[PDB]
Subunit: 363 residues, 4 copies
Amino acid sequence: PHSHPALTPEQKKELSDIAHRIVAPGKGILAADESTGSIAKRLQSIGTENTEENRRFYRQLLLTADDRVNPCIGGVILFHETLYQKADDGRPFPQVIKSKGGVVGIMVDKGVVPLAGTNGETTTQGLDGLSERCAQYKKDGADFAKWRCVLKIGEHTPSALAIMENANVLARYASICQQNGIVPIVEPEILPDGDHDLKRCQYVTEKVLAAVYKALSDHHIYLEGTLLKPNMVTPGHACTQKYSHEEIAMATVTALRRTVPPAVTGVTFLSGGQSEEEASINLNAINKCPLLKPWALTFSYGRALQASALKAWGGKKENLKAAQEEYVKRALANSLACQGKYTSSGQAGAAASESLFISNHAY
Amino acid sequence: PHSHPALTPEQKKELSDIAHRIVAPGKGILAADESTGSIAKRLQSIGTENTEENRRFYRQLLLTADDRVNPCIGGVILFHETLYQKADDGRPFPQVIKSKGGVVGIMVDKGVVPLAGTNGETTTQGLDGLSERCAQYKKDGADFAKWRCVLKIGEHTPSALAIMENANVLARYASICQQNGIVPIVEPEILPDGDHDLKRCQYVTEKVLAAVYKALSDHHIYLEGTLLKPNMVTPGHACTQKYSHEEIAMATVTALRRTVPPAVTGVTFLSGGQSEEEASINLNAINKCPLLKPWALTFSYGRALQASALKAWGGKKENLKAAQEEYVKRALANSLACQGKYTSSGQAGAAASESLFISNHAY
Amino acid sequence: PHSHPALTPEQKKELSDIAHRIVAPGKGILAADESTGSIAKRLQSIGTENTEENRRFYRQLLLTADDRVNPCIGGVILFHETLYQKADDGRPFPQVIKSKGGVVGIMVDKGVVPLAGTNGETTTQGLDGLSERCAQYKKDGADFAKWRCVLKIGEHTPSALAIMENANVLARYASICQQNGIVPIVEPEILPDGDHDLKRCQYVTEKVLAAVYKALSDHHIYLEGTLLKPNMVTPGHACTQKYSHEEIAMATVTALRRTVPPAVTGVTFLSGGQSEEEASINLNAINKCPLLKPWALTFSYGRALQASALKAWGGKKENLKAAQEEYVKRALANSLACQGKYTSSGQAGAAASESLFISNHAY
Amino acid sequence: PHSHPALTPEQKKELSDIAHRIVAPGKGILAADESTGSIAKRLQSIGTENTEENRRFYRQLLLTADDRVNPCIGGVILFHETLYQKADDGRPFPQVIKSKGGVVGIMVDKGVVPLAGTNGETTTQGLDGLSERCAQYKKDGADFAKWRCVLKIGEHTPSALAIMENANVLARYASICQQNGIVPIVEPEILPDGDHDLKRCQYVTEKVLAAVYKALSDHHIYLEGTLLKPNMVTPGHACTQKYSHEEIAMATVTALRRTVPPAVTGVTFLSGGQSEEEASINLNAINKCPLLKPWALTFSYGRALQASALKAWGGKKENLKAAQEEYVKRALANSLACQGKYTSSGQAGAAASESLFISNHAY
């Protein structure tokens, strides 16, 4: 084949730098990119009703935590609106994040659309005018993007089509991102739904990440300028078998060692519906695993950094400080976790709510 | 693999029915899907302003030609605007087209975008929200769609990536279209720009189409409810070698025979810069080839059907009929060609001057 | 991509001719390429020891059937032993077959081997030193070869690995073949085992062939110099649903129309455990399907052309004439079948015999 | 996809162990797999006849080395003949190797065959009956195999086909090996021929490796029981650009980092026509490269470990020890190089190579 460099030595430089700053030792990613609909559900869980002001206030709450958070938070992924909102003192949100030492992230995909002829599988849209939006985003203080692709494990899922198609689109988004000085977080999300064991999930994970990286190679993606946001290898939510956090750290680290090349700056694990405590404990064991990890293994948590804070806040403006505290605790807990310096109480405790719902809550 | 029917027998029936109505014996397709920018170039050449009224009137001009055209036109591809425009009688253009026995088509892609790391190669965007647009377009009288993917021949083109990428986007588009009852026209266009000869073009056409069809298989596209709009195998527009139309017809038919499966209802060739007369002659000879053709071999012309009409229109009502007649002449000339009944007219007058470069100065 | 002529006009010529002559109207293929072990199993049934003499005589009994078979069979696939054997008159078997108007075939594959990591799947070996063997076979009067890959429909079969593998190995065998002036018959045999219905078989068959022809394209295969020896789309050998001959005919032709490009000279269906009469009846209805078939649709039968002959012989020389007749009559019946001119006393397809799997005993 | 364990936990364990022994810190591989034909040319340069004994004596010379190489040689690759030859003391060669601490290897490929339609490209044969060959070789002390694949760089090479095909064939060989408890060494040798620079080769290497690993994943290969035998990223032999060993080391490790998953136990580079010193120097620079190397970077040298010793022999049986010493020094030198503790420099001024191409004479 004949090379035709998509990026210049300088473009590659900026990309690597940004990536290495987000995953810097002890730092992780705050997933604050809940869409108006996602947040609407969560605000109502405490009794609060959805509204722009409430969203701004809530996001501010997380973003204006005391400086203890600074060494823990390497980046914050935001939703389109929050990016253009301002703190009570009139300082635009990206500036607050930036002054705290982090890089501003943006959710760029436009949701998942079904694939015809599949067993309910999907692909993700958002490629239209992506360049134009990536140009505005960076100009407005965005250094990285996030694009989510969902995969599901079943009797005949994920299919060859689902895997190859989803990989191919993630590769496209990534390519576009780099061209505009944007670092792309490739999120090949395999859903925990099902009763499949640890082996199945691990096996699936290996297969999908294979396709993912081969695709990136075909599309000429600069891996040093990318972050991987995969799922931790765990059993299905309906699996009757209990596994030790070590088995999870094992299955996870192994899948990665077999599919993720060293050039990848880092891996930011998603909480995937795990309780706050559990999320940190697993991330700890993953960094406590004897195997050789060529890249950072940190977090990119959403609910696993907001649960207790949301509850403690309860919409009560007076509860601002009490709510921010919970946020801070989880952040520090995970800061240690991505280093293997975390200690828990063998379970979960307060951070153990959530609850598994099977065909019960439509709303 | 495990089947999961994308379409029910009823959906397939409709699709196969529509695709058959467009490529019926002796009928072709009128491409009137120029966008505000494309049509502008054509209006300014004759001296007419690029106004909505002017575009509307010219579009009407062709869409209201005498009934002799009814048997020649199986479908008319319209641009979003023209689709929602009314004729002087207050009737919506689609109703006007379908009353005259024509099937209404719509252009749904959003243009070509660069592929990073390639040699000026591209891909096509437009998939975002396509289902909602296709579902709605169906509600407004459009029965078929059109999507264009541009490929190019060069020292290192088309590349594996460009081929794989465009082939995949086309299959995505089709899948979506068929889910909304819309018949997809795959348009894997291989540009004639260059100095390459017949052999090379043919060779590339065979690879592009093989890839295109395998992609449709992976995507479970219903081949019976599809039309393939390709380029005719011709040498480059700078090649130094005269080729008889017979050779062109041989190379073209051979290429299609090697890659386009029989189930494909019809092939609608595009002019691609050929003179009106040349488009008719090559299409005529294609149909005259001794090789077995298990699919309709007709046209889908733009400039090759409109060239003389635009010129004979002058941009004023006075030449309304004078122009319509040129269009009528060209269509029935091509109507005969897609059956092997056309007989070369010759060359003497009423030709079209596509841009003034080395002519006149003070007129 | 760029061209590098795999074959020259003269080579393409020779191949196209050889292939067309074998599938000439009314003509089919006799598949007597049973390996020493395979034939031993058949001889054991009639009470005849597996002696090279016995093998030579039986093969002779088939090849020396009077001139009535001449217009019926255009090709004879032999085993390495048979190719070098001589008939009673001292003339070599290929000369015998040749004088009778047929072209000699030879099996070249080395059997199937397991694909580790698959649900008991296989792939086929035989590529090592193939070129050398093909050059020898050619010098010895062999003008076409046979390579068989086995695939199976089941719970998680056939898988992507198997499909990709066999499709690719066939293309290797094919390419080599064309280089040595041998016409390759590509045989992607999908076993009829299992309780899978007709629709399942059609789907898998469609997908397998789509992979096959994409593979041939990648390897630059000359489709006009190739034959396809597929399985008919029939229900599983344990299906409880009863199907008519017209249904299997429609399913087989539809599948083919969706995968086999017009350029492919001919399709030589295999028996696949079908009865002698059932095979010919199915072949006939297939050629009586209203759907346009761009290529020849003949047979390449083994047991479906030998059973009665082999059975009547009983290892007794004096039964020679009776045995050969059972054969001649079988060839004659199929000769009409490939032309769609086969009708038994009743002007309808004969009813089945056992059909146990449809009875109440299969519940 | 669905998990179907190709190897039991103990099978994986055996492979991991073998592969790890071969590339333990400080150890490398001795490449003595020169076929009878190839070894002949070498013997001709030292005025020696290529006979049964002469070859055996030469192989003995290397294998019956002073125990000082015991910590240097992790494994030795033998040709089929040598595997069944015995040393003067009456011990079969594989016995000598084992006792001295090294694991016995055997190259199993049967040479390269031309790919049709390509610009003189190739693929490798050897898969036929490979399984039974492995079961026997294993029986006779073999623990690891070798299969070479050649890919040349040029105007349009390597092609997508050569990459796809060679990758698939390497994976087929790998699978068959692991099935018989043999560690397979994947060798996609990218020829250094031509005037292409450093960047072109790195690019091609990245592409080739990307395909190799995807194919291994598709075939369900156990990465922990495999070794890659790639070329170092070095410019073309006809290139006219001076590159320091530091530039070579950088380009090389980065390529592996972007493709080779950390699970790959080790990488045993090949000399690629390099001189003994140059190979030791480049390997040293490669190991002392600042970037994180998750796999063992060692050697597997033929000429670069025999050159001087071979010359010293010059047929004279007396020269035995003097020649054996030159080999010991080379082994020790490289033993230090595979750890990045080798005193050197490398300047094309004193002891230079064919620097003619860089010379003004090449203008």
